[PDB]
Amino acid sequence: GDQRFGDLVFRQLAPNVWQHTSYLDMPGFGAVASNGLIVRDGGRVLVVDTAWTDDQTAQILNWIKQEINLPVALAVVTHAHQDKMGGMDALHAAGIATYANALSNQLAPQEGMVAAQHSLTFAANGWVEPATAPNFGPLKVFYPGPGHTSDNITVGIDGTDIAFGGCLIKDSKAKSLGNLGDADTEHYAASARAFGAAFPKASMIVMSHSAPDSRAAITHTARMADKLR
Ligand SMILES: [O-]
Ligand SMILES: [Zn+2]
Ligand SMILES: [Zn+2]
Protein backbone atom coordinates (compact mmCIF):
# COMPACT_ATOMS: atom_id res chain seq x y z
CA GLY A 1 0.00 0.00 0.00
CA ASP A 2 1.07 3.60 -0.65
CA GLN A 3 2.89 5.24 2.21
CA ARG A 4 2.44 8.99 2.51
CA PHE A 5 5.57 10.53 4.01
CA GLY A 6 5.30 14.28 4.22
CA ASP A 7 4.37 15.46 0.73
CA LEU A 8 5.84 12.37 -0.96
CA VAL A 9 4.52 8.87 -1.57
CA PHE A 10 6.46 5.59 -1.35
CA ARG A 11 5.32 2.24 -2.74
CA GLN A 12 7.07 -1.11 -2.40
CA LEU A 13 7.26 -2.84 -5.79
CA ALA A 14 9.34 -5.92 -5.00
CA PRO A 15 11.30 -7.18 -1.98
CA ASN A 16 14.26 -4.76 -2.41
CA VAL A 17 12.62 -2.11 -4.62
CA TRP A 18 10.46 0.94 -3.80
CA GLN A 19 9.03 3.72 -5.95
CA HIS A 20 9.33 7.33 -4.74
CA THR A 21 6.81 9.90 -5.90
CA SER A 22 6.98 13.69 -5.58
CA TYR A 23 4.82 16.52 -6.88
CA LEU A 24 5.38 19.95 -8.36
CA ASP A 25 2.52 22.42 -8.62
CA MET A 26 3.32 23.68 -12.13
CA PRO A 27 1.16 26.68 -13.05
CA GLY A 28 -0.83 25.89 -16.22
CA PHE A 29 -1.03 22.08 -15.95
CA GLY A 30 -1.54 21.10 -12.30
CA ALA A 31 0.33 19.18 -9.64
CA VAL A 32 2.54 16.81 -11.62
CA ALA A 33 3.69 13.51 -10.10
CA SER A 34 7.14 12.16 -10.85
CA ASN A 35 8.36 8.69 -9.90
CA GLY A 36 11.82 7.30 -9.26
CA LEU A 37 13.24 4.21 -7.56
CA ILE A 38 15.03 3.10 -4.43
CA VAL A 39 16.85 -0.25 -4.49
CA ARG A 40 18.49 -2.10 -1.62
CA ASP A 41 21.54 -4.06 -2.78
CA GLY A 42 22.81 -5.98 0.25
CA GLY A 43 24.09 -3.43 2.77
CA ARG A 44 23.60 -0.32 0.65
CA VAL A 45 20.88 1.65 -1.09
CA LEU A 46 20.86 2.89 -4.70
CA VAL A 47 18.60 5.70 -5.93
CA VAL A 48 17.23 6.30 -9.43
CA ASP A 49 16.21 9.95 -9.96
CA THR A 50 15.83 12.78 -7.53
CA ALA A 51 12.53 14.36 -6.57
CA TRP A 52 11.59 17.70 -8.14
CA THR A 53 13.30 19.73 -5.43
CA ASP A 54 16.18 19.60 -2.98
CA ASP A 55 13.75 19.66 -0.02
CA GLN A 56 11.77 16.74 -1.45
CA THR A 57 14.97 14.82 -2.19
CA ALA A 58 16.13 15.29 1.40
CA GLN A 59 12.75 13.76 2.36
CA ILE A 60 13.53 10.71 0.19
CA LEU A 61 16.78 10.34 2.15
CA ASN A 62 14.83 10.73 5.42
CA TRP A 63 12.43 7.97 4.35
CA ILE A 64 15.38 5.73 3.48
CA LYS A 65 16.94 6.35 6.90
CA GLN A 66 13.65 5.49 8.64
CA GLU A 67 12.54 2.48 6.56
CA ILE A 68 15.84 0.90 5.44
CA ASN A 69 18.55 2.47 7.63
CA LEU A 70 21.48 1.70 5.33
CA PRO A 71 23.83 4.09 3.51
CA VAL A 72 22.95 5.38 0.04
CA ALA A 73 25.94 4.38 -2.10
CA LEU A 74 24.99 6.21 -5.29
CA ALA A 75 22.26 7.79 -7.35
CA VAL A 76 21.75 7.74 -11.09
CA VAL A 77 19.54 10.35 -12.75
CA THR A 78 17.88 9.76 -16.08
CA HIS A 79 18.01 13.16 -17.87
CA ALA A 80 18.41 16.90 -17.27
CA HIS A 81 14.85 17.89 -16.38
CA GLN A 82 13.78 19.06 -12.93
CA ASP A 83 11.73 15.97 -12.10
CA LYS A 84 14.85 13.81 -12.45
CA MET A 85 17.73 16.12 -11.41
CA GLY A 86 16.09 18.91 -9.39
CA GLY A 87 17.44 17.51 -6.10
CA MET A 88 21.11 17.00 -7.00
CA ASP A 89 22.31 19.45 -4.35
CA ALA A 90 20.51 17.45 -1.64
CA LEU A 91 22.26 14.27 -2.80
CA HIS A 92 25.63 16.03 -2.75
CA ALA A 93 24.98 17.53 0.68
CA ALA A 94 24.36 13.96 1.90
CA GLY A 95 27.72 12.78 0.43
CA ILE A 96 26.11 10.51 -2.17
CA ALA A 97 28.04 9.72 -5.38
CA THR A 98 25.99 10.83 -8.38
CA TYR A 99 25.91 9.68 -12.00
CA ALA A 100 24.19 10.85 -15.18
CA ASN A 101 24.58 10.47 -18.92
CA ALA A 102 27.52 12.66 -20.00
CA LEU A 103 25.06 14.56 -22.19
CA SER A 104 22.76 15.18 -19.19
CA ASN A 105 25.69 16.66 -17.26
CA GLN A 106 26.57 18.86 -20.20
CA LEU A 107 22.95 20.08 -20.51
CA ALA A 108 22.35 20.45 -16.78
CA PRO A 109 23.45 24.05 -16.22
CA GLN A 110 21.37 25.43 -19.12
CA GLU A 111 18.37 23.42 -17.94
CA GLY A 112 18.73 25.01 -14.47
CA MET A 113 20.11 21.78 -12.98
CA VAL A 114 23.24 20.99 -11.03
CA ALA A 115 25.29 18.32 -12.84
CA ALA A 116 26.01 14.91 -11.37
CA GLN A 117 29.56 14.25 -10.18
CA HIS A 118 30.22 11.50 -12.73
CA SER A 119 29.38 10.97 -16.36
CA LEU A 120 28.12 7.76 -17.88
CA THR A 121 29.10 7.03 -21.46
CA PHE A 122 27.48 4.53 -23.79
CA ALA A 123 28.53 2.04 -26.40
CA ALA A 124 27.10 2.31 -29.93
CA ASN A 125 24.55 -0.38 -29.01
CA GLY A 126 23.22 1.71 -26.11
CA TRP A 127 24.64 -0.20 -23.14
CA VAL A 128 26.52 1.81 -20.57
CA GLU A 129 30.28 1.46 -20.78
CA PRO A 130 30.80 -0.49 -17.52
CA ALA A 131 33.87 1.43 -16.32
CA THR A 132 31.71 4.57 -16.10
CA ALA A 133 29.13 2.86 -13.85
CA PRO A 134 31.28 1.36 -11.09
CA ASN A 135 29.53 -0.45 -8.25
CA PHE A 136 26.10 -0.18 -9.84
CA GLY A 137 25.22 -3.69 -8.54
CA PRO A 138 21.87 -4.76 -9.99
CA LEU A 139 21.33 -1.51 -11.94
CA LYS A 140 21.70 -2.11 -15.69
CA VAL A 141 21.83 1.21 -17.53
CA PHE A 142 20.78 1.55 -21.18
CA TYR A 143 20.60 4.52 -23.55
CA PRO A 144 17.72 3.65 -25.90
CA GLY A 145 18.20 6.56 -28.30
CA PRO A 146 16.70 10.04 -28.31
CA GLY A 147 13.01 10.24 -27.42
CA HIS A 148 11.50 12.20 -24.58
CA THR A 149 14.85 14.00 -24.63
CA SER A 150 18.14 13.49 -26.46
CA ASP A 151 19.80 12.38 -23.22
CA ASN A 152 17.15 10.08 -21.70
CA ILE A 153 18.46 6.86 -20.15
CA THR A 154 16.75 3.79 -18.71
CA VAL A 155 17.54 1.30 -15.95
CA GLY A 156 16.80 -2.39 -15.46
CA ILE A 157 17.02 -3.99 -12.03
CA ASP A 158 18.74 -7.37 -12.03
CA GLY A 159 17.11 -9.98 -9.78
CA THR A 160 13.67 -8.47 -10.39
CA ASP A 161 11.19 -8.27 -13.23
CA ILE A 162 11.40 -4.45 -13.19
CA ALA A 163 12.67 -2.01 -15.80
CA PHE A 164 12.50 1.77 -15.45
CA GLY A 165 11.70 3.76 -18.56
CA GLY A 166 11.78 7.18 -16.90
CA CYS A 167 9.94 9.80 -18.90
CA LEU A 168 10.36 7.91 -22.19
CA ILE A 169 7.48 5.53 -21.42
CA LYS A 170 3.84 6.32 -20.55
CA ASP A 171 1.27 3.74 -19.38
CA SER A 172 -0.97 1.70 -21.63
CA LYS A 173 -3.96 4.02 -21.11
CA ALA A 174 -2.13 7.34 -21.68
CA LYS A 175 -3.60 9.84 -24.18
CA SER A 176 -0.30 11.56 -25.00
CA LEU A 177 3.47 11.42 -24.65
CA GLY A 178 3.45 14.27 -22.11
CA ASN A 179 6.13 16.94 -22.30
CA LEU A 180 7.61 16.84 -25.81
CA GLY A 181 9.30 20.25 -25.50
CA ASP A 182 12.77 18.70 -25.76
CA ALA A 183 11.75 15.54 -27.61
CA ASP A 184 13.25 13.91 -30.68
CA THR A 185 9.96 13.20 -32.45
CA GLU A 186 11.48 11.30 -35.37
CA HIS A 187 13.33 8.76 -33.21
CA TYR A 188 10.92 8.45 -30.26
CA ALA A 189 9.12 5.29 -31.39
CA ALA A 190 12.33 3.41 -32.16
CA SER A 191 13.83 4.48 -28.83
CA ALA A 192 10.79 3.24 -26.91
CA ARG A 193 11.02 -0.10 -28.72
CA ALA A 194 14.78 -0.29 -28.07
CA PHE A 195 14.13 0.10 -24.33
CA GLY A 196 11.75 -2.87 -24.51
CA ALA A 197 14.26 -4.92 -26.48
CA ALA A 198 17.05 -4.16 -23.97
CA PHE A 199 15.01 -5.56 -21.07
CA PRO A 200 12.95 -8.31 -22.71
CA LYS A 201 12.16 -10.22 -19.50
CA ALA A 202 10.87 -7.21 -17.56
CA SER A 203 7.18 -7.65 -16.76
CA MET A 204 6.79 -4.53 -14.59
CA ILE A 205 7.55 -1.26 -16.32
CA VAL A 206 8.08 1.71 -14.01
CA MET A 207 8.00 5.21 -15.43
CA SER A 208 8.09 8.81 -14.35
CA HIS A 209 4.55 10.01 -14.98
CA SER A 210 2.38 6.91 -14.76
CA ALA A 211 1.95 4.17 -12.14
CA PRO A 212 3.73 0.88 -12.84
CA ASP A 213 2.27 -1.09 -15.73
CA SER A 214 2.81 -4.15 -17.88
CA ARG A 215 4.83 -4.13 -21.09
CA ALA A 216 1.70 -2.74 -22.78
CA ALA A 217 3.12 0.61 -21.61
CA ILE A 218 6.01 0.11 -24.04
CA THR A 219 3.93 -1.03 -27.00
CA HIS A 220 1.32 1.71 -26.46
CA THR A 221 3.96 4.40 -26.06
CA ALA A 222 5.75 3.31 -29.24
CA ARG A 223 2.48 3.09 -31.16
CA MET A 224 1.55 6.63 -30.10
CA ALA A 225 5.04 7.78 -31.08
CA ASP A 226 4.58 6.26 -34.55
CA LYS A 227 2.15 9.21 -35.03
CA LEU A 228 4.89 11.78 -34.31
CA ARG A 229 6.93 10.75 -37.36
O1 LIG B 1 10.50 15.33 -17.48
ZN1 LIG C 1 11.85 15.10 -18.89
ZN1 LIG D 1 9.44 13.80 -16.73
Side-chain angles (χ1 to χ4, degrees):
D2 287 343
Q3 186 190 353
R4 296 187 297 270
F5 182 91
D7 205 45
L8 285 76
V9 178
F10 298 82
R11 182 190 281 189
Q12 187 170 21
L13 303 185
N16 290 36
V17 184
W18 302 259
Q19 184 182 252
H20 67 79
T21 306
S22 60
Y23 295 85
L24 185 68
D25 298 293
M26 294 186 67
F29 293 85
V32 182
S34 183
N35 305 316
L37 291 168
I38 303 170
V39 177
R40 185 179 60 72
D41 174 34
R44 72 210 183 115
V45 176
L46 319 173
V47 172
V48 181
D49 290 335
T50 72
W52 295 94
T53 71
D54 292 315
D55 284 348
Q56 292 167 354
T57 301
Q59 285 281 62
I60 293 171
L61 302 181
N62 292 335
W63 179 96
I64 292 169
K65 172 61 179 180
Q66 171 176 297
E67 297 292 342
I68 304 174
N69 194 26
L70 291 169
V72 178
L74 62 92
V76 58
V77 299
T78 63
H79 62 277
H81 282 163
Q82 190 188 339
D83 49 330
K84 314 284 81 191
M85 289 181 75
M88 299 308 286
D89 275 339
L91 297 181
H92 296 160
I96 296 164
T98 59
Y99 297 82
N101 184 352
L103 182 56
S104 304
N105 287 332
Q106 181 195 309
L107 296 170
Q110 75 199 66
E111 297 295 332
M113 301 299 109
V114 171
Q117 291 166 339
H118 303 286
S119 290
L120 304 178
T121 62
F122 297 86
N125 64 16
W127 288 110
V128 71
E129 295 179 309
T132 72
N135 301 116
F136 268 47
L139 304 186
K140 293 188 112 69
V141 186
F142 180 71
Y143 174 64
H148 168 76
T149 58
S150 58
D151 61 319
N152 55 203
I153 60 170
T154 66
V155 186
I157 305 170
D158 195 51
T160 80
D161 308 314
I162 296 166
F164 183 69
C167 310
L168 182 67
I169 306 299
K170 320 304 194 192
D171 78 23
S172 61
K173 300 184 182 180
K175 285 166 55 276
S176 82
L177 298 166
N179 176 20
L180 293 175
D182 292 317
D184 186 321
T185 54
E186 171 55 32
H187 296 104
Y188 201 126
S191 298
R193 292 185 174 110
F195 164 71
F199 304 108
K201 301 296 176 293
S203 59
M204 181 187 297
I205 306 305
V206 181
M207 68 216 80
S208 296
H209 305 299
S210 304
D213 200 4
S214 75
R215 297 183 72 84
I218 301 165
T219 53
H220 176 61
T221 292
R223 194 69 181 126
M224 281 201 296
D226 286 334
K227 305 159 185 184
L228 296 176
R229 307 179 67 211

